[PDB]
Amino acid sequence: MKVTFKDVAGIEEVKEEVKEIIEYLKDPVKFQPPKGVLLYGEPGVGKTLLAKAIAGEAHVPFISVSGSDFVEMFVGVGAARVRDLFETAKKHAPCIIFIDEIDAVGRADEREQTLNQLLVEMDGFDTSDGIIVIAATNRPDILDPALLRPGRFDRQIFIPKPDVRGRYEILKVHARNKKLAKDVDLEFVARATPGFTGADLENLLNEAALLAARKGKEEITMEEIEEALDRITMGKGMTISPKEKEKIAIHEAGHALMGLVSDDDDKVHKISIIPRGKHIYDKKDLYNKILVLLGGRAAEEVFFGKDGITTGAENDLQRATDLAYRMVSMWGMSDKVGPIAIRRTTAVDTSPDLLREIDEEVKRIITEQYEKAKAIVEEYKEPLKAVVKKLLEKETITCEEFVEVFKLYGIELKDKCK
Amino acid sequence: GLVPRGSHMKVTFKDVAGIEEVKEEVKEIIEYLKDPVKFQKLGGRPPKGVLLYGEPGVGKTLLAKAIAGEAHVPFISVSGSDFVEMFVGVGAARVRDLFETAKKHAPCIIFIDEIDAVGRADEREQTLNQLLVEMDGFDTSDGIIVIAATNRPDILDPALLRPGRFDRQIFIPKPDVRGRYEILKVHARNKKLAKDVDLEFVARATPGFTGADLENLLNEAALLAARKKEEITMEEIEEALDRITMGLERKGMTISPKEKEKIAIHEAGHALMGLVSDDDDKVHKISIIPRGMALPIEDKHIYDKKDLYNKILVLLGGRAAEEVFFGKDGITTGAENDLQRATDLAYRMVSMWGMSDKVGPIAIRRTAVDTSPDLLREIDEEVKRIITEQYEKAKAIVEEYKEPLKAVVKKLLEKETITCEEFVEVFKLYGIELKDKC
Amino acid sequence: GLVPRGSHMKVTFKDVAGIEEVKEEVKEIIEYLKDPVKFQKLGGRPPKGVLLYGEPGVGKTLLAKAIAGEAHVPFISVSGSDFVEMFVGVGAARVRDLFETAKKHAPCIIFIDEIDAVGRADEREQTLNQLLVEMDGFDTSDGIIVIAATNRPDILDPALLRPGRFDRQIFIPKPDVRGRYEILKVHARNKKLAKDVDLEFVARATPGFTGADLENLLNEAALLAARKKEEITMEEIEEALDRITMGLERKGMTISPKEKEKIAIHEAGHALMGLVSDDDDKVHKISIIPRGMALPIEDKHIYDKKDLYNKILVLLGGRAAEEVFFGKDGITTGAENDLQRATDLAYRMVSMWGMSDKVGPIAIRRTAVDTSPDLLREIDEEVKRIITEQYEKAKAIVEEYKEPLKAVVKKLLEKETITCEEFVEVFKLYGIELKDKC
Amino acid sequence: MKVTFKDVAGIEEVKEEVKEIIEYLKDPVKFQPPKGVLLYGEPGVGKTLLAKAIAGEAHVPFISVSGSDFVEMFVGVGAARVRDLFETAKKHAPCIIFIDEIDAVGRADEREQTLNQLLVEMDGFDTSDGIIVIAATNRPDILDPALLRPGRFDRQIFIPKPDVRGRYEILKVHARNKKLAKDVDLEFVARATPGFTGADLENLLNEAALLAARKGKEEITMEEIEEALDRITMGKGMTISPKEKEKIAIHEAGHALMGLVSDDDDKVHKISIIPRGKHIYDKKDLYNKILVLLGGRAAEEVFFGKDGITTGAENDLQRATDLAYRMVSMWGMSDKVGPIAIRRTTAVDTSPDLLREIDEEVKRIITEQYEKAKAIVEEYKEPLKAVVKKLLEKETITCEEFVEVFKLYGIELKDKCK
Ligand SMILES: Nc1ncnc2c1ncn2[C@@H]1O[C@H](COP(=O)(O)OP(=O)(O)O)[C@@H](O)[C@H]1O
Ligand SMILES: Nc1ncnc2c1ncn2[C@@H]1O[C@H](COP(=O)(O)OP(=O)(O)O)[C@@H](O)[C@H]1O
Ligand SMILES: Nc1ncnc2c1ncn2[C@@H]1O[C@H](COP(=O)(O)OP(=O)(O)O)[C@@H](O)[C@H]1O
Ligand SMILES: Nc1ncnc2c1ncn2[C@@H]1O[C@H](COP(=O)(O)OP(=O)(O)O)[C@@H](O)[C@H]1O
Ligand SMILES: [Zn+2]
Ligand SMILES: [Zn+2]
Ligand SMILES: [Zn+2]
Ligand SMILES: [Zn+2]
Secondary structure, three states, rough: OOOOHHHHHOOHHHHHHHHHHHHHHHHHHOOOOOOOEEOOOOOOOOHHHHHHHHHHHHHOOOOEEEEHHHHOOOOHHHHHHHHHHHHHHHHHOEEEEEEEOOOOEEEHHHHHHHHHHHHHHHHOOOOOEEEEEEEOOOOHEEEEEHOOOOOOHHHHHEOOOOHHHHHHHHHHHHHHHEOOOOOOOOHOOOOOOOOHHHHHHHHHHHHHHHHHHHHHOOOEEEHHHHHHHHHHHOOOOOOOHHHHHHHHHHHHHHHHHHHOOOOOOOOOOOEOOOOOOOOEEEEEHHHHHHHHHHHHHHHHHHHHHOOEEEHHHHHHHHHHHHHHHHHHHHOEEOOOOOOOEOOOOOOOOHHHHHHHHHHHHHHHOOOHHHHHHHHHHOOOOOHHHHHHHHHHHEEEHHHHHHHHHHHHOOOOOOOOEE | OOOOOOOOOOHHHHHHHHHHHHHHHHHHHHHHHHHHHHHHHHOOOOOEEEEEEOOOOHHHHHHHHHHHHHHOOOOEEEEEEHHHHHHOOOOOOHHHHHHHHHHOOOOEEEEEHHHHOOOOOOOHHHHHHHHHHHHHHHHHOOOOOOEEEEEHEEEEEEEHOOOOOOOOEEEEEOOOOOHHHHHHHHHHHHHOOOOOHHHHHHHHOOOOOOOHHHHHHHHHHHHHHOOOOOOOOHHHHHHHHHHHHHHHOOOOOOOOOOHHHHHHHHHEEEEEEHHOOOOOOOOOOOOOOOOOOOOOOOOOOEEEEEHHHHHHHHHHHHHHHHHHHHHOOOOOOOHHHHHHHHHHHHHHHHHOOOOOOOOOOOOOOOOOOOHHHHHHHHHHHHHHHHHHHHHHHHHHHHOOOOHHHHHEEEEEEHHHHEHHHHHHHHHHHOOOEEEEEE | OOOOOEEEEOOHHHHHOOHHHHHHHHHHHHHHHHHHHHHHOOOOOOOOOOEEEEEOOOOOHHHHHHHHHHHHOOOEEEEEHHHHHHHOOOOOOHHHHHHHHHHHOOEEEEEEEOHOOOOOOOHHHHEEEEEHHHHHHHHHOOOEEEEEEEOOOOOOOOOHHHHOOOEEEEEEOOOHHHHHHHHHHHHHHHHHHOOOOOOOHHHOOOOOOHHHHHHHHHHHHHHHHHHHOOOOHHHHHHHHHHHHHHHHHHHOOOOHHHHHHHHHHHHHHHHHHHHHHOOOOOOOOOOOOOOOOOOOOOOOOOOOOOHHHHHHHHHHHHHHHHHHHHHOOOOEEEEEEEEHHHHHHHHHHHHOOOOOOOOOOOOOHHHHHHHHHHHHHHHHHHHHHHHHHHHHHHHHHHHHHHHHHHHHHHHHHHHHHHHHHHHHHHHHHHOOOOOOOO | OOOOHEEEEOHHHHHHHHHHHHHHHHHHHHHHOOOOOEEOOOOOOOOOHHHHHHHHOOOEEEEEEEEHHOOOOOOHHHHHHHHHHHHHHOOOOOOOEEEEOHHHOOOOOHOOOOOOHHHHHHHHOOOOOEEEEEEEEEOOHHOOOOOOOOOOOOOEEEOOOHHHHHHHHHHHHHHOOEEOOOOOOHHHHHHHOOOOOOOHHHHHHHHHHHHHHHHHOOOOOOHHHHHHEEEEEHHOOOOOHHHHHHHHHHHHHHHHHHHHHHHOOEEOOOOOOOOOOOOOOOOOHHHHHHHHHHHHHHHHHHHHHOOOOEEHHHHHHHHHHHHHHHHHHOOOOOOOOOOOOOOOEEEEOOHHHHHHHHHHHHHHHHHHHHHHHHHHHHHOOHHHHHHHHHHHHHHOOOOOHHHHHOOOOOOOOOOOOO
């Protein structure tokens, strides 16, 4: 029932980020200031596991609760439950309140009261009390922004799906209890499970142990590992085909290329075939953000043609369009429309002609930037092929490695590496 | 100490008929119940809960009892409907008492019929919480298995299906003609019928029947014989069958032969599209028996325009076959579902994924943020273009292969279920080679 | 009798820096606390409650303590967050006990930090009611003053601001470069730094910092010196400043120099429009420091078409300056708010006030009572006409005065804040006379 | 803590109107029949003060409550609170129930139950019980009409902002407690605070006393009065500029002129530069009501041109348009549209062509009447200037004074004076 960082694998950056929280929990008054922390990511990537590991590293109790227990209760219950949860946590401090499925309470009627109670409690406890609240969710896109205001979950962390190195380390962690054979190559398993989560890998090793026992053996052999993987694939886990890997690699490479070419100030992050996940900007910065967002799809079209574009661009595309709309309907960055602003569902009833103008202008912006991105990808198609080769091999490369590959072709790129 | 005491079962796989696949699926559970320590020897965690869902009378409880008997372990049965009167009130037991009584008799099976009675979306809530607590907490390592059963899986509290508690579901389908035949044989053992009857005819004559219905037919025939002379004859079977089938045709859904033909053509069109497409998934078995129940883009992570076009094609295959075989006046409402999905998919391609050239790479997350009528008109025109293009393609494909499809439809109306491989063979007998997607 | 006992404060206006206007505003309260009977000699009722709001670390609690020390009166402090554990439960005090303890020590100050903890829009409700009852009921004539503080004034229960209870609010803004310099001086007294440092550079290098941040910087420098030799040098200050500024730039909003230039141009355009308009209100000071927080036609009773046109002009001034200085690609999202208001205003002029000739004197109270598309088209066309007309006018005005505006922007990026009079002087140095609206 | 009519100033008409209620409260059975009374007006005009004065004149207790205390309560509380309020009032009868912010409960979900409870209680108590319910509100335009049905608040009274005479009398009332100097001219203060409310005047005298004390004096002098007024104006109270006064005077004069010229039966009220605030009609009566409503704006345009029209017409204009709509969509008073009736949000989905016809016809009606009003104002521009001069001087004149000024120009006007 004890958990520590030894049981978590493949997220060294997150461990570094939460080292401060662990130091705080070990001795709060000495440290003093994070209040709340949000963990978001697909199911089975280790959010609850990470919270429990943080709790165990500081040798503090771990209070686990779900939004589901608060959401469905009769009228007036959920708020008193939140308040009593915080009081019981205060009494056992120092401790951690873990709230899984925080989206169940924090969407953007009765749930509203419970949400407000949560906000009150988050703001009320001083740092002297010695509590840290960790929330977890699969749906960060539908969260009430109030939850992220300073003092309330003012620090968010993404837990990504594991790459090959992460998958290998996870397989090591979960192999420890099981008595595997010498022949098994967990590295091969890692390279054979792109798109798996830590939970998927646990289930794979467990099914392999089950099949081994069913065959009366005493050691788990590559036979059973491959059998379990084939079982799951043939009809829980979803694996990425090599063709899919190539498509994703090209999309992400186009994204990074646009990031590294645009006349912007945003820093380009690492390139990986794992899916990705309040300031002032000017018209040009926004055009270039759109460009970056359209880069992956532009690469898809340049390499595979109009019939090869994929759903992987979905997110990106939406954001791009959304941005264009804000540029036209909220920020008056269109000449044809002018410096008029309507949207905040809008507030005033708009005529159809004006909506048609807004739509036409959004299409103009998006298609212009899309042609720009397609042209850029065409110009640098060969260094991009090089990057994609390195990417399909290692599954992930650094922005610095991207720049290096590109200068190998006599191309100097902007120093935007994060 | 109010919970019923567990008892062994006098039922085994010999008493179940027509679901060999389900038997394969539960072989793992039976091996575990025969020897838990062997399973856990390598720290391999086994399954805790298992949900059986299917129409009433298809053999869910029978399957649970048969599993219990194959391992020679006790079988503790309780009904979800009884839970409130069982585990709520002064003097009444608690759910924990059920699980502990099972632990003492371990290895054994706890069977919960009508689990939906407690786990839909009050006191029943208290009982449900007790059950969930026990499922998450209780150390099942001793070798007990919880099997839940329900006829209404569409109204199950998703909390019941979270990992660790009933995280494994199994569908028990209605028996096809061979399955009905085997069930009739199984229940004939006790009745000792007369010589003249050939049960295969009874099977072929009862599409859409469940094992329970065949039981009731044979028992009514034996009763009529007793009321009539030591021997059960075709006369009495035909009388009982006419009675039950007439009584059921009104309330309920019976498979008319015309309905059977329509269904066969629809499913054959689906399968044909699946087997002709360039880049698709693997084709499953073809059958006029419903293939599941509640509890279309999730087989892969990303899809490309071609994969989505081909998915649309498949979805339109059934209607295309209907039109080719029966003409524009013979298309049916059975395609309803399919059609919707197809159209829905097309919409996503145009308004969400920017896979239309005319529309462009614009994306509208969904539902709509005040869109001009011109844009909606463009989206609709493009959706209609895609759908009609794929529909003409599918109609052409069916036209090309109309004769081998007629062959498949005949084999299907006969056997009620065929394999993808049999499909390929029927097609090879017409000098037509199909891709090995089976 | 659980409430904390009141104690005098060792803080006065000498310890507060960079908010001389707030000091003027609270001079009345300090005079009252020095001698209540003098105030009430002519039956002049004084203020009861005072709300201080501003970003965290700008000196709200410091200001309250300084007011308490200037009058030499006790200072009773309590946190809103503590109220529930303070005034709720068996044995716990009551809010009345706080107010009466203050009355006995009168004249004094009750300071309630984080008043938002109790007064947002349960037991906290009970405590809030107790506080309100005391605010309305208690005879403060003895000379006690309640000062509330909050960082989140946008979520305050408006009941807290009704007349008689916290009916007076004061904003404490972030310090400009001069204010930061004075704060650094204040906190230098205790630290005795080395000779080489010129704190003015540190001030200029810390836009958007609060007094607390400057405190933390100087204390970290003194700590590093101790860990390093009796003297604090530029080396250690630069190290600490780099540390804190790097750590803050990520989470939070820091003022880049480009951001500072954009903000300066925006605010300068606002002020220029204000100073050029024919019939407007008086122009306030120009500064790149935010000028308020939550808790555009209310300065007069009635407005005419010209006044509204000029208000629109002002609202569009910032964006017009942005475009003139940076071109169509340099306009920014900072104008967002402004733009909305402008457009909103135009709409009211057309659909609510009948100030359009093309539309006529028709009025649609708001939102809409089934209006034909033709009418919405006319309203939109007229709104666009108004907004673009005023925007071209504003762009022309900025073009005409681009050089003196560059001068103002330079002075602004230097000092971070300037007066309307300094604006007029900068403009007079270019042979341009502006109206005396200061 | 005692209040009477001596503490209220500048509303003799309201005191006359409530004399009957005071007689009722002094001896209810002898009198017998008003049940409820609504006071509406801008904040700080003395609604609560008037209620307390009524309570004190009859020597009866005064039960004060706010809608705000009823509105926010958990489900099922507000109705039991209303019922218990009426029971406690019945026990202490004769008394007054005063409900401030009656709009908080009486708008047009859970609040609905409390509102119904209020209605039940209003209807249930007979006149024998001896209670009077006085409601107060700033937003009479959003009140549920059920509150005004006979037997429930069947008498409404508007409390207007004080004119110069009212402001002077209020300054007298509030000066009594303060020890002013001989030099102070409260009449000058009155003429210097157009658009002030009684509360604004109280605050002015109080700030003046504060400044006097701060300067160590013993008497409040014009210095302090002017200083306090300058303080409030320079950065609580809103004063009307003389240009604003001229605009308002012209608007109100146009209103009155239309009232006195139209072929109607409605009576014209007094003319004042203070803002203003179930029968059968025929098409002509409605056209003339529209005309009157458009008179103020028409005068504004005639005197100051298209760039001088003001927001003061807002109310008027809206009503006019609303009326036109009812004439076209509800009463079939348009030939082009016909005797069709749709609106009661309408009930049946209407085609766009018909909505365009309705809008075009409404515009026709409004513009016709607006040209009519502009022409009338042009014809009588000089007598109107005379009225405006008298109005800027006295701030208020009677309809009879209006007619007199006009006959001084050889113009006989209809005897519509109220
Ligand atoms: N990064 C990881 N490292 C080690 N184990 C993991 C990781 N991710 C998932 N797991 C395993 O998968 C299972 C699910 O983890 P959990 O944290 O509950 O998922 P989530 O928090 O995303 O709901 C756990 O049993 C855990 O051991
Ligand atoms: N597939 C089958 N094979 C053999 N017998 C069956 C089958 N399905 C149903 N039966 C018979 O029908 C009866 C009903 O089975 P049961 O499992 O109780 O129904 P359900 O699972 O729908 O509640 C049993 O007596 C059983 O012997
Ligand atoms: N304007 C200022 N002048 C001098 N010192 C300041 C100023 N603002 C903040 N400080 C210092 O920063 C610290 C925080 O002040 P405090 O009033 O507690 O913050 P807040 O009011 O935001 O809660 C105090 O120790 C104070 O000395
Ligand atoms: N007509 C008036 N005569 C005398 N005093 C007035 C008048 N109007 C307002 N006041 C003063 O203004 C303050 C607010 O009065 P109140 O009746 O509470 O306003 P309302 O009823 O409009 O909310 C009171 O203290 C009162 O003395
Ligand atoms: Zn992308
Ligand atoms: Zn189908
Ligand atoms: Zn602005
Ligand atoms: Zn008017």
